[PDB]
Symmetry: C4
Subunit: 25 residues, 4 copies
């Protein structure tokens, strides 16, 4: 388990990557 | 809970994203 | 130990960096 | 505490930011 802050940051980070890929495609 | 180093890095990461968005807007 | 979500995000983050470096080189 | 993998990724992430800032400056 992790700090809820870290879990939040991890989710935001992944979604940021996915949005960037979809934008490029 | 997480390592204080990881908590620190998560905070820096989020603030980096927010500053980038505000700069673009 | 960390949340499996955070572990996943950390792996994705590193691989993203490695791919970017290899692309530049 | 966090997974050693996550600790590693956090350190790499911060150093990446610092190097980028120093490069820009
Ligand atoms: Ca933990
Ligand atoms: Ca806490
Ligand atoms: Ca420690
Ligand atoms: Ca969980
Ligand atoms: Ca482990
Ligand atoms: Cl963690």
């Amino acid at each position: 388990s992790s700090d809820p802050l870290v879990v939040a940051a991890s989710i935001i980070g992944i979604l940021h990557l996915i949005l960037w890929i979809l934008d490029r495609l």
